[PDB]
Ligand binder design. Structure first.
Ligand SMILES: *[C@@H]1O[C@H](CO)[C@@H](O)[C@H](O)[C@H]1NC(C)=O
Ligand SMILES: *[C@@H]1O[C@H](CO)[C@@H](O)[C@H](O)[C@H]1NC(C)=O
Ligand SMILES: *[C@@H]1O[C@H](CO)[C@@H](O)[C@H](O)[C@H]1NC(C)=O
Ligand SMILES: *[C@@H]1O[C@H](CO)[C@@H](O)[C@H](O)[C@H]1NC(C)=O
Ligand SMILES: *[C@@H]1O[C@H](CO)[C@@H](O)[C@H](O)[C@H]1NC(C)=O
Ligand SMILES: *[C@@H]1O[C@H](CO)[C@@H](O)[C@H](O)[C@H]1NC(C)=O
Ligand SMILES: *[C@@H]1O[C@H](CO)[C@@H](O)[C@H](O)[C@H]1NC(C)=O
Ligand SMILES: *[C@@H]1O[C@H](CO)[C@@H](O)[C@H](O)[C@H]1NC(C)=O
Ligand SMILES: *[C@@H]1O[C@H](CO)[C@@H](O)[C@H](O)[C@H]1NC(C)=O
Ligand SMILES: *[C@@H]1O[C@H](CO)[C@@H](O)[C@H](O)[C@H]1NC(C)=O
Ligand SMILES: *[C@@H]1O[C@H](CO)[C@@H](O)[C@H](O)[C@H]1NC(C)=O
Ligand SMILES: *[C@@H]1O[C@H](CO)[C@@H](O)[C@H](O)[C@H]1NC(C)=O
Ligand SMILES: *[C@@H]1O[C@H](CO)[C@@H](O)[C@H](O)[C@H]1NC(C)=O
Ligand SMILES: *[C@@H]1O[C@H](CO)[C@@H](O)[C@H](O)[C@H]1NC(C)=O
Ligand SMILES: *[C@@H]1O[C@H](CO)[C@@H](O)[C@H](O)[C@H]1NC(C)=O
Ligand SMILES: *[C@@H]1O[C@H](CO)[C@@H](O)[C@H](O)[C@H]1NC(C)=O
Ligand SMILES: *[C@@H]1O[C@H](CO)[C@@H](O)[C@H](O)[C@H]1NC(C)=O
Ligand SMILES: *[C@@H]1O[C@H](CO)[C@@H](O)[C@H](O)[C@H]1NC(C)=O
Ligand SMILES: *[C@@H]1O[C@H](CO)[C@@H](O)[C@H](O)[C@H]1NC(C)=O
Ligand SMILES: *[C@@H]1O[C@H](CO)[C@@H](O)[C@H](O)[C@H]1NC(C)=O
Lengths: 135, 135, 135, 135, 135
């Protein structure tokens, strides 16, 4: 990736910024800009490229073959009991929360068993993340 | 990716910004801009490209073959009981929440068993994310 | 992706912005802009490209073959009982919520068993996301 | 990656910034900029490239073969019981939270059993992250 | 990576910054900038490259072969019981939280059993991270 930029507030090439009650007198600004950008990116010169997969099985006996790919959960138990009992009481609850499984961003590109890959693969994530604001 | 930009507030090439009760006097601004951009991106020069997959089975005996791809959940139990009992009580509840499974963004590109791939693959995610604001 | 931009508020090439009771005096602005953009993107030069898949089975015995693709859920139980019992009580509930499975954005491109792919694949997601605002 | 930049507040080439009630007198600014950028990135010169995978099985006996890919969870138990009992009491709860499994950003590129890969792979993550703000 | 930059507040080539009620008198600024950048990055010159994997099994007997990839969890138990009992009491709780498993950023590139890889692989993470702010 030639350019990746996380810019919180202000991004600019040339900035004249005047703010919060200033006095801006005789000003002469002369700006002469020559800017040129040449991008030669991902250029590929190939005579011959071959992807070849071959399998042959002869006179064989195969019994109980199990192939299990990734990300298997099987047996998961979440037990979260909440019990509130009051006889003669005063209860004030402000900003209370229970969260079990919270997922913001899931990016999954190549999940397989057998992968043959020729090329280019890129993942980019940018965020501002605030979970809980109370008060 | 040639250019990826996360810009919170303001993005500009040339900015004259005057704000919050300033006094802006005699100003002479002369701006002369020569800007040229040439993008040669993803150019491919190929005589011959071959993707070849072949399978042959002869005189074989195959019994109990099981192939299971990725992301298998099987047995998942969520138990979240909530019981509230009050005899003679005062209960004030403000901004209370229960969330079990919350998913914002799920991106899944290549999930398979066998994959043969020639080319280019790109995933880009940008967000501002605030979960809970109370008060 | 040549250009991806997350811009919260203001995006502009040249900006003269005057705001919140300023006094803007004699101003001379002369702007001379030469801007040229040339995009050569995804150009492909191919004599011959071949995608060839062949399978042959001879004199074979196949019994109990099971192929199961991805994303299998099987057995999932969500139990969320809520019981409220009051004899002589005062109950004030403001902004209370229960959510089990909430999904904003699901993007699924290539989910298969066998995939042969020549080309280009791109996924882009941009959002502003606020879940719960109370008060 | 030629350029990666985390910029909290302000990013600019040339900045004239005047802020918080200054007095800006006779100013002469003459700016002459010649800037040129040439990017030759990811250029590949290949006569012949071959990816070849071949398997042959003959006169063999295979019984109880199990292949299990990565990220297997099996048996996971989360027990979080909460019990509150009050006879004659005053309870004030402000900003209380229980979270079991919270995931912001999950990026998974190549998870397989057998992978043959020719090319370029890049993962970039930038964020501002604040979990809980109370008061 | 040619350039990686963590910049907390301000990044600029040439900066004239005037702030907090200064008096800026007769100023003459003459700026003459010649800046040129040439990037030749990731250029590869290859006659022939061969990735070849071959397996042959003959007249063999294979029983109880188990191959288990990485990141296996098996049996994990989280027990966090919380019990609060008050007869005649005053309880004030401000900013109290219980978190079991919290994950901000998980990046997984190449997790496999057998991997043959020709190329370039890069992971870059930049963040500002504050967990809990109370008061
Ligand atoms: C601008 O310069 C002239 C020079 O003749 C001067 O008389 C005038 O007072 C100046 N005004 C300001 C606002 O700087
Ligand atoms: C502006 O820049 C160009 C770039 O070569 C130059 O030829 C020209 O003389 C400059 N003009 C002035 C007034 O400096
Ligand atoms: C590579 O590209 C150049 C053009 O930039 C061309 O002249 C040359 O013949 C190419 N070589 C091959 C056939 O791979
Ligand atoms: C195949 O597996 C099953 C259960 O996994 C088992 O009961 C059976 O005996 C196995 N077959 C042989 C020939 O061992
Ligand atoms: C602008 O400049 C002229 C120069 O003759 C001066 O008389 C005038 O007061 C100036 N006005 C402002 C608003 O700067
Ligand atoms: C404006 O820029 C062009 C770019 O070459 C230049 O030829 C021209 O002389 C400039 N004009 C002035 C008034 O500086
Ligand atoms: C590659 O492209 C160039 C044009 O840029 C062409 O002259 C050359 O013959 C090509 N080579 C081949 C046939 O791969
Ligand atoms: C095939 O599998 C089933 C259950 O998985 C088992 O009952 C059976 O005996 C197996 N067959 C052989 C020949 O082992
Ligand atoms: C503009 O400039 C002229 C110069 O003759 C001056 O007389 C006038 O007061 C100025 N007015 C403003 C609003 O700057
Ligand atoms: C405006 O820019 C063009 C671009 O070449 C230039 O030829 C011309 O002289 C410029 N005009 C002025 C008044 O500077
Ligand atoms: C590639 O494209 C060029 C034109 O840009 C052409 O002259 C050349 O013959 C092409 N090569 C082939 C046939 O792949
Ligand atoms: C095929 O599978 C079934 C159940 O999966 C099993 O009952 C049966 O015995 C199997 N056949 C053989 C020949 O093992
Ligand atoms: C600008 O310079 C002139 C020079 O003749 C001077 O008379 C004037 O007072 C100056 N004004 C400011 C605002 O600096
Ligand atoms: C501006 O920069 C260019 C770059 O070569 C130069 O030729 C020209 O003389 C400069 N102009 C001035 C007024 O210095
Ligand atoms: C490599 O590229 C150059 C052009 O930059 C070309 O002249 C040369 O023939 C190429 N070599 C090969 C065929 O790999
Ligand atoms: C194959 O495995 C099963 C259970 O994993 C077992 O009961 C059986 O006896 C095994 N077969 C042989 C021939 O050992
Ligand atoms: C600027 O310089 C001139 C020189 O003649 C002087 O008279 C004037 O007072 C100066 N003004 C400022 C604001 O420095
Ligand atoms: C500005 O820089 C260029 C760069 O070579 C030079 O040729 C020119 O003479 C400079 N101009 C001045 C006024 O110094
Ligand atoms: C390597 O690249 C050069 C061009 O920079 C080219 O002249 C030379 O023939 C190439 N060598 C090979 C064929 O690997
Ligand atoms: C294969 O493994 C199973 C359990 O893992 C076992 O009961 C069985 O006896 C084994 N087979 C042989 C031939 O040892």
């Amino acid at each position: 990736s030639i350019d990746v930029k996380y810019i919180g507030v202000k991004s600019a090439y040339v900035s004249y910024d005047v703010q919060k009650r200033t006095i801006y007198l005789n000003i002469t600004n002369t700006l002469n800009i020559t800017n040129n950008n040449y991008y030669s990116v991902e250029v590929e010169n190939i005579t011959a490229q071959v992807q070849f997969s071959k399998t042959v099985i002869g006179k064989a006996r195969l019994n109980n073959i199990t192939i299990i790919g990734p990300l298997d959960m099987k047996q998961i138990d979440y037990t979260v009991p909440t019990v509130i009992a009051e006889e003669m009481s005063y209860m004030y609850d402000f900003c209370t929360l229970i969260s079990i499984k919270v997922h913001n961003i899931v990016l999954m590109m190549q999940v397989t068993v057998t992968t043959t890959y020729f090329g280019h693969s890129e993942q980019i994530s940018q965020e501002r993340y605030q979970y809980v604001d109370c008060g």
